Symmetry: C2
Subunit: 126 residues, 2 copies
């Protein structure tokens, strides 16, 4: 099957944790992914390796890792690739409990027009 | 008139400033705000007070400040508010070259369903 692992930055302040939880809850409401887990980059648990361990624990063979980050940075271009064990020539390979699970690392949000939409909603106090 | 100031984190690595550049270009394309500028909180210029300097320079009486941040944090709840000289109520009282300029500080993006849409788009490589 296929899992979605959402990945966000650590903050010491709890706002980002709630952000990731609620995002995972809404993507769960769309019922397109059997397993949806969350992972925090720093400070707070779960840690991202925990997200992957639990995604496989419920039975996933392909773990889609989505950087829940506006722009690229050190975290998305260096930290997360190394935490998940991605590298050159190959995309991703995890070998656990007699199971070969593949990882696919996705892109940040970027300058999507929907961010613009939200920006303008906010500008008008909405 | 009223200006829009987009506000970003800023990084020694350049992705965030270019993100803000592109977002400001798209909202300019939307032709809802007469003046649109961006401001970086750290490392990179232009800066938030500099953004305000130029927003007033082109002629603003009302400064719409939007935090281009996923969740709340120290920058959005403490740092950036003090950089602007606001504290909670209304936010705005600024006085330059014979001008009473208002700032209105908006809220972060949050767990908008449109971030969910983008997340899923990314998950499928879209």
């Amino acid at each position: 099957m296929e899992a979605l692992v959402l990945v966000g930055h650590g903050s010491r302040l709890p706002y980002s944790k709630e952000l990731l939880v609620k995002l995972a809850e809404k993507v769960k409401e769309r019922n397109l992914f059997p397993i949806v887990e969350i992972g925090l980059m720093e400070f707070s648990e779960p840690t991202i390796p925990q997200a992957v361990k639990k995604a496989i624990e419920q039975g996933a063979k392909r773990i889609i890792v989505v950087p829940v980050f506006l722009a690229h940075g050190i975290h998305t271009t260096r930290d997360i690739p190394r935490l998940l064990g991605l590298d050159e020539n190959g995309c991703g390979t995890l070998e656990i409990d007699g199971k070969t699970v593949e990882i696919i690392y996705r892109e940040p949000i970027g300058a999507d027009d929907r961010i613009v939409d939200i920006i303008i909603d906010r500008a008008f106090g909405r």
